[PDB]
Symmetry: C2
Subunit: 175 residues, 2 copies
């Protein structure tokens, strides 16, 4: 059981918006988004069929041990506290993120933001929040979507078994 990123986020097709802009932030197209056929990022679990949720959050482009990136993910579907959580189709085993937007935190706020990511307890690679002290070290123009998948356990209704976090190609703030 592992997750495959079947359609990668287009690396330069969405402007990140600040909270001060009061928008929906939009949606991140897929690499293959086309003229008459729009696309969106999508994953696919392998080796397993059953209940399984997915947590998506921003991690740094930076290092194999990517760290929580301050930026919040907002979206009509499942996004709370910059983290976005949705349940996967229990038979097809795939999900397509059609409303996943990136709301960029500005420098002044990086700390309080990372402060919150910690409360929520979202830390894909067990990186801790050391980077919250050194805020300028974080590149606020690039991120990667992190997909942490959790299989239903044995304790019915409790998604307990975590598959290994999978990181997407880098997404760069478009102008």
């Amino acid at each position: 059981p592992y997750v495959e990123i079947t359609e990668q986020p287009h690396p330069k097709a969405l402007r990140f918006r600040y909270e001060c802009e009061g928008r929906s932030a939009g949606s991140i197209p897929g690499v293959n988004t086309t003229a008459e056929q729009k696309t969106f990022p999508s994953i696919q679990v392998h080796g397993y069929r059953g209940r399984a949720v997915v947590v998506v959050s921003c991690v740094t482009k930076e290092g194999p041990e990517h760290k929580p990136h301050p930026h919040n993910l907002v979206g009509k579907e499942g996004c709370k506290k910059g983290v976005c959580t949705v349940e996967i189709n229990s038979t097809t085993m795939s999900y397509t993120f059609n409303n996943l937007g990136i709301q960029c935190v500005k420098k002044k706020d990086v700390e309080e933001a990372l402060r919150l990511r910690q409360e929520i307890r979202v830390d894909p690679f067990r990186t801790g929040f050391g980077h919250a002290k050194e805020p300028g070290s974080i590149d606020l123009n690039a991120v990667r979507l992190c997909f942490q998948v959790f299989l239903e356990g044995q304790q019915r209704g409790r998604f307990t078994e975590p598959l290994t976090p999978v990181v997407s190609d880098i997404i760069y703030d478009k102008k």
Copy 2:
């Protein structure tokens, strides 16, 4: 007794700085500031010789009934609460503002600022603070220096007699 603006502020020779920039804001040269001979704004009282202080503050470029402009004047000499107060040479009857800088308030702060100008009670033309409600109406790229001169009264040490406020030519934020 009236005040003459003997050397007018150069209209385009100083960048206004935000409080967030943590500088001295500089000094406003005079219209005639030259290569080997730098100049600065200056006034001259006429019709009177004696004690007399001067209050300088920013008013709008706008209308003969200029209103308190949010921007604060800072300067090594006499500037407190964006308002700057200095005592005039009791014999020559002139003062030359060699350290008068303009610290620009940003939109978010216009209100609280004008709020404060009111507390201080600086309102040259009896305009009230109606403009504090409509903050976008104020052009944050131009100001005029207002020189309110007060003659010593009869109550020794109390500058009581106000001469009529005199307004300087417009000063425009340089890039």
